[PDB]
Design an enzyme around this catalytic site. Structure first.
Site, short mmCIF file in Angstrom:
data_model
loop_
_atom_site.label_atom_id
_atom_site.label_comp_id
_atom_site.label_asym_id
_atom_site.label_seq_id
_atom_site.Cartn_x
_atom_site.Cartn_y
_atom_site.Cartn_z
N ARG I 47 0.80 -1.22 0.00
CA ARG I 47 0.00 0.00 0.00
C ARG I 47 0.84 1.27 0.00
O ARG I 47 0.27 2.36 -0.14
CB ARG I 47 -0.94 0.01 1.21
CG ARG I 47 -1.85 -1.21 1.28
CD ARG I 47 -2.85 -1.09 2.41
NE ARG I 47 -3.01 -2.34 3.14
CZ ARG I 47 -3.73 -3.37 2.72
NH1 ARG I 47 -4.37 -3.34 1.56
NH2 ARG I 47 -3.79 -4.47 3.47
N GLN L 91 -3.45 -11.90 9.93
CA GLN L 91 -3.08 -11.97 8.53
C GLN L 91 -4.06 -11.16 7.68
O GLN L 91 -5.13 -10.76 8.13
CB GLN L 91 -3.04 -13.42 8.06
CG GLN L 91 -2.59 -14.40 9.13
CD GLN L 91 -1.79 -15.55 8.56
OE1 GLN L 91 -1.60 -15.66 7.35
NE2 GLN L 91 -1.30 -16.42 9.44
N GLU L 92 -3.67 -10.94 6.43
CA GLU L 92 -4.44 -10.13 5.48
C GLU L 92 -4.69 -8.74 6.04
O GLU L 92 -3.79 -7.89 6.04
CB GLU L 92 -5.76 -10.82 5.14
CG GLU L 92 -5.61 -12.26 4.67
CD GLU L 92 -5.16 -12.36 3.23
OE1 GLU L 92 -5.31 -11.36 2.49
OE2 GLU L 92 -4.65 -13.43 2.84
N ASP L 93 -5.91 -8.49 6.53
CA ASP L 93 -6.26 -7.21 7.11
C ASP L 93 -6.72 -7.31 8.55
O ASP L 93 -7.12 -6.29 9.13
CB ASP L 93 -7.34 -6.52 6.27
CG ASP L 93 -6.87 -6.20 4.86
OD1 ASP L 93 -5.72 -5.74 4.71
OD2 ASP L 93 -7.66 -6.41 3.91
N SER L 94 -6.68 -8.49 9.15
CA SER L 94 -7.11 -8.64 10.54
C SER L 94 -6.10 -7.99 11.48
O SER L 94 -4.93 -7.79 11.15
CB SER L 94 -7.28 -10.12 10.89
OG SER L 94 -8.58 -10.58 10.55
#
Ligand SMILES: [Mg+2]
Ligand SMILES: [Zn+2]
Ligand SMILES: [Zn+2]
Lengths: 56, 168, 270, 71, 144, 111, 55, 66, 172, 57, 447, 115, 83, 168
Positions: I47, L91-94
């Site tokens: 990002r 993980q990811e967006d957690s």
């Protein structure tokens, strides 16, 4: 196009997903409320009569 | 451009060659120009490919165009899917566009046809005519709420008395 | 000086912090002691609030949470029985402490409500529990809410025993400093030097306290962490020395309960 | 015609000791009681929880059978 | 159970983008054709250039009283005791690994490749003369 | 709301036992012990003390899921040694060490 | 009617009139209210040029 | 609205430090850092609790009550 | 707040709570400071959210010094000045800190980025989105399940799911 | 429109706003119809009386 | 639901929280994250549907995607970086941690492997635990560039009897590669074995990473003085070349490439020079970065990030382009009011010579905002267009059947292919292979 | 030069160090942030009203939002954030959030609904 | 229209056929149909169906329909199961 | 030379070398006649159509030409006797495994190949990035590629944006 090839159905749920490294590859964590709401009809058989009576 | 011309000794080597790129589509007259190779001339426009070549050549050109389209993102697609798509698009003697004026204007069932585009027109056409819907498609069975003859429904399950008395 | 067990050495002591060095002890024992001290000491805190009149600008849940976050004296906490294990309907004198708070706005200016305004109406039976902790020069204590003229606050609170594991309001310790091996002699971490490790990474204050600086000697693979520097800070409900003593006692009680369960299951098996 | 219907009650014993709630539904020996502070419903034995008055006062056990009233 | 023995003077030590594992190349001082290229952990065995490191390849760590046997594979390795004895006590660096390659170079030179959990060692010598008793699952003992 | 009760992670429920031992068929003289309401606090100490023993060939613990406060401890001892005896010895050593540490801390604080 | 339904016009012929001129004030956050009170909209209805940020 | 009773991160009780902080800011003319150090807040977790606190209770109290 | 609630920073880094941990299980520094939130580092490089780290460092410096930090754009503030101020305070040039595992208390390699960061709670909560239907209220005209969480509606089996099931071959 | 020349809050001070149960941080600029606050979104249109030349297909 | 992998059959596990929990490896076929996604769950109501869902739509049954002829599931996110760091040559694990990791992996035979180093101190290599997790009987061999049987860079891969010999595990082994470990395990053993391997690898890597730790910071995007000086020198040289090109073009001394005018050739030269300068600066910045850099470590693992990300974050941002060209003259012969008329310098036309860490000037900030707006509009149009295209394509071929005579026919029975795929082979059971007869020389072929 | 930003974009700290899509996402999501929307609450009757228990001023303030009254009415809290791969549950967006902070009153809020 | 010596279909058993047979057997067992094999104490109809299919004791016949309309009958016990 | 093929011979031979431990030194047991006959029998045993008439037999024969060529390349007598040194049992196991894998790799009748092809073509279309520009090589001709090109191909547009022609 809105009521024949696509329609609303019963016995379905929808909630926010999350990650869990401790779960298996083929496994989904179902909340207790969803499990208590959704039901599956099971025919009583000599092999599960006691289990069904306990559940009832 | 460079072409992988096989070497006289057996191996494959890169032999540079001159390639002419044109911004127009007049391959009907370009092929007759002396000094060029008419057996290797290629056009990115497949619509007029079968004007001078066959339907099979048009299908091959369409497949090559689709493969070139799916070439830059890095995704790899199996040949069977694109081959099936181009064969469906060229089942008849000409190009069959994926639109309301292409594969739609076919002899398939009215119920399965009328589920994508405008519906009441084809329903009125069916009423005016007396065509029979064989109901062997998937859309017709979905509308009628029956097990479509696809996958698990492609066969029938029967019980036999001889095997029933065989076991016991 | 008691046997070849863990050894202690107190560096600095105060009314709210204690600094000591742990030696001749394994890392697991120190970590377990720290975890017990931060999340296993039973204390006293307000658990149930009954509101009669609340004309202030704050919500009832707001005031209930603020009251539950107020520390209370828990010196004689071992003489109070758990509510779940008590033979009573809701709460009695032997398992809970009842506190009442009344506030009214008389002066035109804002009238603050402090933790010192809480009044114990139950019978302590000589036990030293329930008194709010006021660590302040002015003696006012923790500010609860502010109300102007006309506004009236009146409620009753019940304090019950609990541990920090159930809720964070029962924790007697604020922050515990844990450190070992000020130099990288054990190579337990890899530094992120950009040009040099020594200049970029500041030296800890425990480097001077023992632990002589390393030399160009070969790495010692037979060494293990045995010296730990710890600093325990107390909220105020329990003294720091009492906090450490109760942590050790709780760990010993847990291990003894495990042993008792093992013996009981062995007897039942036979 | 159960007496334990729409009455303010207090749960004794168990993990919900001292909680305040109102009985909603009764299913045999088990009754569903809501909670004031907590936004959840729990089911416990009707003979266990005490009974209070709607306005507020003394609390009594399940002996309300002999006195079909509140309090 | 010994299968190899030499002096193997070491030279040109350069790990390469590493801090705990070094690659050492050595040549035997007795045979003119023997060569070694082994990865070692310098944190526990800090060798240097121009050094003599006696190497030894053994099928098992048991003493001479117990002959070599195939029952030692997959024995659920246990922590060493106090009274137990083994060939490793006479050396300073012992490594366990598996052989995975047997290459033929020139006409009488063979190379044996071993992998000690990720550390690779290449050994050369005269076929049917020196490296004629190496099959798989052999220890590697190094003495200062 | 599906949020579990806060006391469920440290209070033994009805019909549940603190200890539950199952023999392990993977290796001889190996057992698996399941604890309840513990979160790493006794597990790390017990594993370290068991590894400190000389007759113990294996000692490890794990927590299957953070949702439930329960961990499984597996002990494998040498031939002729009961794993329960090793656990009792480790617990006794832990008690002795904790008592000595408490006495030393009290003596140091007294001055 | 115009200030409530957001259709700028009389009661009749509302189909041919513009919609969305009047909107309920967003009071979730002070910043949200400030942003909603300084908002402009161009009625366009496939085209990338009008959506681009011009110099 | 009002100062939190305890620090969110560690749990240090800061409920009586708001009045002292204001008094040190308005009598002794000290900067925020020196007043924070004087109050005893060493870790920045406790420092941020009262350094970035908004006292919205006064605005609510401005309105006439019942 | 609970598991599933949406949270985000001031730089477009949205997310939801997946797990919760107590103070003992959380990693801690040498001074006993535990973090309120933990963010995966994998979200940074993709990002290009450098301003997130810059604001974290600036907030750490401001909290240590007590003076408000200026984060206005097109200013003369650079990362070098913030690093110099942090080093003068005596923590770290780049904000890295040495933490411990917490479960076992062992020292942790790969020192962790630390520092306060502004976060905001969004209007999307898991409590207002969880739905489940099993033979609920019925419609009138189409005699198909009603739509809407408030009126106990049912999820729609759209056409895309239909062709997905067709491709799966599951006719029954 | 709120806080306009015809509104009662145009000349009100902070004390007057507090007495009238109005937030001093409110900025106005919205219409209160049927008890609901409505804001008129600015509409963007091409300027008139301007000569423009474009090329067709 | 675009592809068939969007529909899967799972096993219900009741959890004490009101959310849906799934394995991290199934997010890739779902194309879903955990920032607020919503997903639907359907339950069967009969034995027919339950059995057919279990035997046809099970998650392990769809490991290999028939679309790309490659597995659609693999190790992703921090598990990839953990497996890369664990398999490093210098990674060693002590006895207690080794025992904990061994116990964490299920279906373990209970046999402790012999440590790699035994004499000074018992130490187990990082690859040993992974080999323990990997089931026996699987052999893999991949050769990278400059990879031999004694590779010094620890590249490539070689597994014998389910034991790692050499090579750091990366995205090319436990990822979605055609020749990866997942594909080999799925083809050799059953899908259940592949799922068990997935779970064991995830558990062991997560446990190792929990006690090791991985982070990132602002300093990971900071280069030293000489590197920034070299980047500035390269940018200055590129600007000088652009200025020379402009001066040559303004004097009408620049020839025009055939097929294009002078303006197009000049713009092409300018953009080529700017892109080459940006690539060179990014390559220099990447080379300068050390092996301990967190961003670089993520790049090697392949879990997240790329070379362009490092370039734009540390060295220089690329030239902003709208509609495939530089910033157009929005004003009369000007891009912004702060510039002069007829200014063709790269700064005025939308070249960002700064970096994200350094900061952006207002002009390049506006140019970047315009580029981002163009990108957002492009995606917003493209998603709808591709959705309509997918719907039309599905409608076109919704009745194609492979019948029992190995012919593909539509609903009407018309034959469109006398044999499916011209070979009659399932897509999911095809692997890339090399034909040795076609290649080589005549002498080599004869030999 | 910084005056060219809007109300939502004036809250972003160091907007020049971020990609444009990130700034757009933050500007869009700022309006959904929960906080003290107005001091006039408790006397108004709105259909929905979400307010924060303990709103806090940001540490990284910007000069542009001084006139926006953001410090007087903040819409967030200052939370200590550690960027790490801990337990593999983020993980990811957690994200992983401390339970003790939640129990002590972090990010909890009030909900008001009117009929 | 049921040839036997001219059966050109594959002798193997397809995945769809296997799923359909297992489902039908499980449903019949669930609705109390006689079982021709011992259960070993099993109580789940689906696993009983798999056990019956393992030893080829399912009295069912598969009717494969040709596109024209003809068909041939294949017994379950004569179909090779390899997947 | 790298083309997708059903059965991986290299993996099979590697597995057969790992099992049935090969001494690499003792002479092999295979004979030339045995190897040739086994290869021919394996070629004849590959069935994908299972017909009796001449047309179906020819279709089956020419539908496995590539696989037969690969099998001949990978199972030459010299290759077996020099590199893939196996025994008679190992050779028989290899042949049986190859036959079983080939028979298990055949497409199951009743599968929806049209829907699979449509999804496999449409998924990369959604997964592609912007495709409006940047498709220029040496000459900036602005050649149409990506989503617009795919749309105009599917619609069979008679007037493409950038018609092209190649002459050799
Ligand atoms: Mg998402
Ligand atoms: Zn009591
Ligand atoms: Zn604090």
């Amino acid at each position: 196009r809105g009521n024949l090839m696509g329609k609303r159905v019963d016995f379905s749920a929808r909630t926010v997903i999350s990650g869990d490294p401790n779960l298996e590859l083929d496994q989904v964590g179902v909340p207790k409320s969803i499990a208590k709401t959704l039901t599956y009809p099971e025919v009583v058989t000599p092999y599960n009569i006691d289990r069904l009576t306990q559940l009832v | 451009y460079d072409r992988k011309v096989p070497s006289p000794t057996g191996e494959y080597v890169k032999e540079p060659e001159w390639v002419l790129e044109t911004d127009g589509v007049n391959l009907s007259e370009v092929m007759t120009v002396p000094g060029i190779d008419p057996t290797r001339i290629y056009t990115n426009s497949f619509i007029d490919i079968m004007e001078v070549l066959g339907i099979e050549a048009g299908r091959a050109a369409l497949y090559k165009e689709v493969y070139n389209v799916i070439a830059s993102d890095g995704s790899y697609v199996n040949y069977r899917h694109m081959a099936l798509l181009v064969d469906v698009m060229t089942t008849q003697g000409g190009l069959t566009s994926v639109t309301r004026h292409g594969f739609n204007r076919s002899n398939t069932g009215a119920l399965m046809r009328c589920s994508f585009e405008e519906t009441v027109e084809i329903l009125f056409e069916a009423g005016a005519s007396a065509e029979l819907d064989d109901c062997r498609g998937v859309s017709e069975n979905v509308i009628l709420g029956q097990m479509a003859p696809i996958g698990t429904g492609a066969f029938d399950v029967m019980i036999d008395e001889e095997s029933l008395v065989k076991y016991m | 000086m008691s046997e070849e067990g863990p050894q202690v050495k107190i560096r600095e002591a105060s009314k709210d912090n204690v600094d000591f060095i742990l030696s001749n002890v394994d890392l697991a024992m120190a970590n377990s002691l720290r975890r017990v001290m931060i999340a296993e000491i039973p204390t006293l805190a307000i658990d149930s609030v009954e509101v009669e009149t609340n004309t202030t600008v704050l919500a009832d849940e707001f005031i209930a949470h603020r009251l539950g976050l107020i520390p209370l004296q828990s010196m004689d906490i071992e003489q109070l029985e758990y509510s779940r294990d008590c033979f009573c309907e809701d709460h009695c004198d032997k398992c809970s402490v009842v506190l009442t708070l009344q506030a009214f706005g008389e002066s035109e200016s804002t009238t603050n409500v402090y933790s010192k305004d809480l009044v114990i109406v139950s019978n302590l039976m000589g036990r030293n529990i329930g008194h709010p902790i006021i660590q302040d020069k002015e003696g006012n204590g923790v500010l609860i809410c502010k109300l102007r003229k006309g506004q009236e606050l009146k409620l009753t609170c019940v304090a019950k025993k609990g541990i920090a594991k159930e809720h964070a309001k029962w924790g007697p310790a604020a922050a515990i400093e844990f450190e070992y091996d000020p130099w990288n002699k054990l190579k337990h971490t890899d530094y992120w030097y950009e040009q040099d490790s020594a200049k970029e990474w500041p030296q800890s204050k425990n480097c001077e306290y023992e632990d002589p600086p390393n030399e160009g000697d070969p790495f010692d693979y037979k060494a293990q962490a045995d010296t730990f520097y710890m600093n325990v800070e107390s909220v105020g409900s329990i003294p720091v020395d009492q906090v450490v003593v109760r942590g050790i006692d709780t760990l010993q009680k847990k291990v003894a309960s495990i042993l008792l369960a093992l013996t009981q299951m062995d007897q039942d098996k036979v | 015609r159960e007496v334990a219907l729409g009455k303010t009650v207090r749960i004794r014993s168990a993990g919900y000791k001292g909680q305040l709630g109102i009985v909603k539904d009764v299913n045999g020996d088990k009754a569903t009681v809501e909670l004031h502070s907590k936004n959840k419903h729990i089911t416990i034995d009707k003979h266990k929880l005490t009974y209070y008055n709607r306005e507020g006062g003394e609390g009594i056990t399940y002996d309300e059978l002999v006195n079909r009233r509140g309090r | 159970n010994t299968l190899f023995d030499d002096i193997f003077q070491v030279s040109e030590v350069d790990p390469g983008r590493y801090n705990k594992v070094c690659r050492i190349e050595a040549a035997s001082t007795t045979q003119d054709q023997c060569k070694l290229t082994l990865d070692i952990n310098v944190e526990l065995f800090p060798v240097a250039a121009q050094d003599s490191l006696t190497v030894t390849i053994a099928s098992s760590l048991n003493l001479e009283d117990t002959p070599a046997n195939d029952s030692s594979a997959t024995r659920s390795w246990r922590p060493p005791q106090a009274g137990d004895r083994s060939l490793a006590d006479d050396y300073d660096y012992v490594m366990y690994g598996t052989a995975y390659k047997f290459e033929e170079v020139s006409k009488d030179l063979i190379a044996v490749y071993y992998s000690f959990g990720g550390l690779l060692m290449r050994l050369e010598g005269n076929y049917r003369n020196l490296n004629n008793l190496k099959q798989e699952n052999a220890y590697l003992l190094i003495r200062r | 709301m599906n949020a579990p009760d806060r006391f469920e992670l440290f209070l033994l429920g009805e019909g549940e036992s603190k200890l539950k031992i199952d023999p392990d068929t993977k290796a001889p003289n190996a057992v698996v012990i399941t604890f309840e309401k513990e979160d790493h606090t006794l597990g790390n100490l017990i594993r370290a003390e068991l590894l400190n023993d000389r007759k113990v060939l294996f000692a490890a613990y794990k927590v299957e899921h953070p949702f439930f406060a329960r961990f499984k401890l597996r002990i494998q001892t040498t031939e002729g040694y009961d794993p329960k005896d090793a656990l009792k010895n480790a617990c006794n050593s832990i008690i002795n060490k904790l008592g000595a540490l408490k006495t030393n801390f009290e003596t140091e604080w007294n001055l | 009617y115009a200030l409530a339904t957001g259709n700028w016009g009389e009661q009749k012929k509302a189909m041919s009139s513009r919609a969305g001129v009047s909107q309920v004030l967003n009071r979730y956050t002070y910043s949200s209210t400030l942003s909603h009170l300084r908002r402009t909209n161009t009625p366009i209805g496939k085209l990338a040029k009008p959506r681009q940020l011009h110099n | 609205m009002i100062v939190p009773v305890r620090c969110f991160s560690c749990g240090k009780v800061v409920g009586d430090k708001w009045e002292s902080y204001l008094n040190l800011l308005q009598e002794d003319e000290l900067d925020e850092g020196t007043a924070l150090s004087r109050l005893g807040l060493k870790r920045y977790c406790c420092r941020r609790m009262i350094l970035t606190h908004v006292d919205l209770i006064e605005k609510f109290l401005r309105y006439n009550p019942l | 707040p609970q598991i599933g609630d949406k949270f985000a920073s001031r730089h477009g880094q949205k997310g939801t709570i997946g797990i919760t941990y107590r103070r003992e299980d959380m990693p801690f520094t040498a001074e006993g400071i535990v973090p309120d939130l933990i963010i995966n580092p994998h979200a940074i490089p993709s990002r290009m959210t450098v301003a997130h780290l810059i604001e974290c460092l600036l907030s750490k410096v401001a909290a240590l010094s007590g003076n408000e930090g200026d984060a206005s754009p097109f200013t003369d503030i650079t990362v070098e000045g913030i690093s110099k101020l942090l080093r003068e305070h005596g923590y770290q040039s780049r904000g890295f800190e040495v933490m411990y595992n917490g479960h076992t208390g062992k020292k942790l390699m790969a020192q962790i980025f630390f520092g306060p960061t502004y976060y905001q709670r969004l209007r999307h909560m898991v409590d207002d989105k969880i739905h489940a239907r099993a033979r609920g209220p019925m419609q009138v005209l189409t005699r198909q399940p009603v739509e809407g969480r408030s009126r106990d509606g049912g999820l729609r089996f759209g056409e895309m799911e239909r062709d997905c099931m067709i491709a799966h071959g599951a006719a029954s | 429109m709120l806080r306009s020349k015809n509104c009662y809050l145009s000349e009100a001070t902070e004390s007057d706003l507090y007495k009238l149960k109005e937030c001093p941080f409110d900025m106005g600029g919205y219409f209160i119809i049927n008890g609901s606050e409505k804001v008129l979104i600015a509409q963007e249109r091409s300027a008139g009386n301007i000569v423009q030349v474009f090329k067709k297909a | 639901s675009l592809h068939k992998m969007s529909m899967m059959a799972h096993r219900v596990k009741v959890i004490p929280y009101s959310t849906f929990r799934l394995n991290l490896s199934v997010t890739s076929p779902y194309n879903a994250d955990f920032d607020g996604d919503e997903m639907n769950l359907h339950v069967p109501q009969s034995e027919e549907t339950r059995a057919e869902l279990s035997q046809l739509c099970a998650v392990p049954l769809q490991i290999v995607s028939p679309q790309s002829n490659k597995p659609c599931m693999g190790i992703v996110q921090d598990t990839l970086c953990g497996i890369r760091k664990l398999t490093l040559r210098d990674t060693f694990i002590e006895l207690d941690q080794v025992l904990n990791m061994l116990y964490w992996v299920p279906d373990w035979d209970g046999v402790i492997p012999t440590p790699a180093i035994i004499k000074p101190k018992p130490l187990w290599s990082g690859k040993q635990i992974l080999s323990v997790a990997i089931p026996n009987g699987i052999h893999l061999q991949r050769f990278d560039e400059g990879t031999t049987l004694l590779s010094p860079k620890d590249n490539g891969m070689l597994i014998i009897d389910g034991q790692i010999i050499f090579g750091v595990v990366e995205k090319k082994t436990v990822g979605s590669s055609n020749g990866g470990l997942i594909h080999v395990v799925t083809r050799e053993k059953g899908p259940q074995v592949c799922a068990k391997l997935f779970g064991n690898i995830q558990k062991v890597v997560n446990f190792w990473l929990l006690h090791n730790g991985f982070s990132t910071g602002i300093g990971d995007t900071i280069a030293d003085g000489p590197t920034m000086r070299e980047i500035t020198e390269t940018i200055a040289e590129a600007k000088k070349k652009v200025l020379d090109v402009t001066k040559e073009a303004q004097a009408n001394l620049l020839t025009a490439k055939h097929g294009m005018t002078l303006r197009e050739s000049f713009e092409d030269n300018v953009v080529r020079f700017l892109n080459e300068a940006r690539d060179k600066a990014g390559r220099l910045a990447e080379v300068n970065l050390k092996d301990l850099n967190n961003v670089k470590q993520m790049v090697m693992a392949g879990s997240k990030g790329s070379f362009i990300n490092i370039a734009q974050m540390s060295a220089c941002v690329g030239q902003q382009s709208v509609e495939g060209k530089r910033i157009a003259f929005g004003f009369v012969d000007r891009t912004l009011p702060h510039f002069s008329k007829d200014d063709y310098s790269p700064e005025s036309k939308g070249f960002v010579e700064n970096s994200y860490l350094r900061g952006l000037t207002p002009q390049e900030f506006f140019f970047h905002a315009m580029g981002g707006r163009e990108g957002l509009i492009d995606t917003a149009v493209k998603t709808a267009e591709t959705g309509y295209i997918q719907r039309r394509l599905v409608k076109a071929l919704e009745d194609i059947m492979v019948h029992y005579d190995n012919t593909t026919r539509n609903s009407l029975g018309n034959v469109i292919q006398f044999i499916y795929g011209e070979d009659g082979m399932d897509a999911a059971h095809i692997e890339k292979q090399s034909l040795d007869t076609i290649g080589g020389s005549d002498a080599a072929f004869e030999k | 030069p910084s005056m060219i930003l809007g109300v939502a974009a004036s809250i972003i700290p160091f907007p020049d160090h971020n990609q444009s899509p990130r700034n757009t996402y933050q500007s869009a999501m700022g309006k959904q942030a929960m906080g003290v929307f107005l001091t006039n609450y408790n006397v108004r009757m709105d259909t929905m009203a979400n307010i924060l228990y303990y709103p806090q001023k940001p540490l990284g303030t910007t000069r542009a939002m001084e006139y926006l009254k953001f410090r007087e009415l903040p819409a967030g809290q200052n939370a200590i954030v550690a960027i790490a791969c801990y337990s593999g549950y983020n993980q990811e967006d957690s994200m992983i959030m401390n339970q003790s902070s939640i129990d002590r009153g972090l990010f909890r809020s009030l909900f008001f609904r009117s009929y | 229209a049921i040839p036997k010596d001219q059966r050109a279909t594959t002798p193997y058993m397809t995945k769809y056929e296997r799923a359909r047979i297992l489902g039908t057997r499980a449903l019949q067992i669930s609705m109390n149909a006689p079982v021709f094999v011992d259960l070993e104490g099993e109580t789940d109809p689906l696993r009983i169906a798999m056990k019956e299919l393992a030893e080829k004791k399912i009295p069912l016949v598969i009717r494969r329909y040709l596109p024209d309309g003809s068909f041939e009958d294949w017994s379950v016990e004569e179909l090779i199961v390899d997947l | 030379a790298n083309w997708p093929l059903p059965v991986n011979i290299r993996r099979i031979i590697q597995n057969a070398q790992q099992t049935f431990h090969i001494d690499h030194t003792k002479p092999s047991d295979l004979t030339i006649k045995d190897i040739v006959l086994g290869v021919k029998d394996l070629q004849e045993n590959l069935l994908v159509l299972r017909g009796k008439n001449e047309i179906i037999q020819n279709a089956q024969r020419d539908a496995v030409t590539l696989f037969c060529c690969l099998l001949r390349s990978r199972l030459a007598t010299r290759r077996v006797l020099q590199e893939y040194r196996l025994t008679k049992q190992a050779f028989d196991w290899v042949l049986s495994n190859i036959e079983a894998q080939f028979l298990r790799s055949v497409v199951h009748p009743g599968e929806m190949v049209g829907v699979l092809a449509a999804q496999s073509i449409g998924e990369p279309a959604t997964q592609m990035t912007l495709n409006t520009f940047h498709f220029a090589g040496v000459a900036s001709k602005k050649v149409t590629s990506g989503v617009p090109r795919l749309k105009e191909i599917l619609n069979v547009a008679k007037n493409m944006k950038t018609p092209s022609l190649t002459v050799y």
